[PDB]
C-alpha cells in the first residue's frame, strides 16, 4: 500500500491549520470555504484589525458566490481581531442579515456560534443565507496562549 495510502489522507485531512471561521451555505448556492488567520498576529495585534474577508459575486472577494443581481460584488465582509474574537462587517448595497435581523452596514458585530448571514433581501425568492462555523481549535489556542521564545 503506497498510492492508496495517499488517497486515504485525501479524505481524512487534518483540519485546523490556522482557521478562524468556516462559511457554509445552507441554501445551496456557494461551496463551503474556510476562513483563516495567523494566531500570533491575532494574539499580538489587538487594535484596528488583523485579517478581514470579503464576500460577494466578485472574483476578488475572498468568497465567490455567483452573480446575484440583488447581491453586490462584495456583499459582506468578515473581520477578525479584538481580544481573541471575530467580527462581522456588512458591505452590501441592500444590506446584510443575521438570522433574519438586518444589521447596520459597514458595522462591526460580535461573532456567534454557528451564526448565519442572510443576503439579497427585498424579494422572498431573492434571498441567500450563509452559516458561520467557528473553529473550536482557534479558541482553545487563545485560552492557552502559547509563548514564543527562542531557545
Amino acid at each position: 500500500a503506497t498510492q492508496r495510502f495517499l488517497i486515504e489522507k485525501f479524505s481524512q485531512e487534518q483540519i485546523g491549520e490556522n482557521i478562524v471561521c468556516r462559511v457554509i451555505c445552507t441554501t445551496g448556492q456557494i461551496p463551503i470555504r474556510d476562513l483563516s488567520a495567523d494566531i500570533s498576529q491575532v494574539l499580538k495585534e489587538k487594535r484596528s484589525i488583523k485579517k478581514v474577508w470579503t464576500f460577494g459575486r466578485n472574483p476578488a472577494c475572498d468568497y465567490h458566490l455567483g452573480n446575484i443581481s440583488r447581491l453586490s460584488n462584495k456583499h459582506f465582509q468578515i473581520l477578525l481581531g479584538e481580544d481573541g474574537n471575530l467580527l462581522l462587517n456588512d458591505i452590501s448595497t441592500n444590506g446584510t442579515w443575521l438570522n433574519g435581523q438586518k444589521v447596520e452596514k459597514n458595522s462591526n458585530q460580535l461573532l456567534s456560534q454557528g451564526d448565519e448571514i442572510t443576503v439579497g433581501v427585498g424579494v422572498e425568492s431573492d434571498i441567500l443565507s450563509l452559516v458561520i462555523f467557528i473553529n473550536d481549535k482557534f479558541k482553545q489556542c487563545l485560552e492557552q496562549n502559547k509563548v514564543d521564545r527562542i531557545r
Partner: peptide
C-alpha cells in the same frame, strides 16, 4: 453587471 438597489419600506 453593476449592483441594482432593491426596494425599501420607509
Amino acid at each position: 453587471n453593476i449592483t441594482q438597489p432593491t426596494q425599501q419600506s420607509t
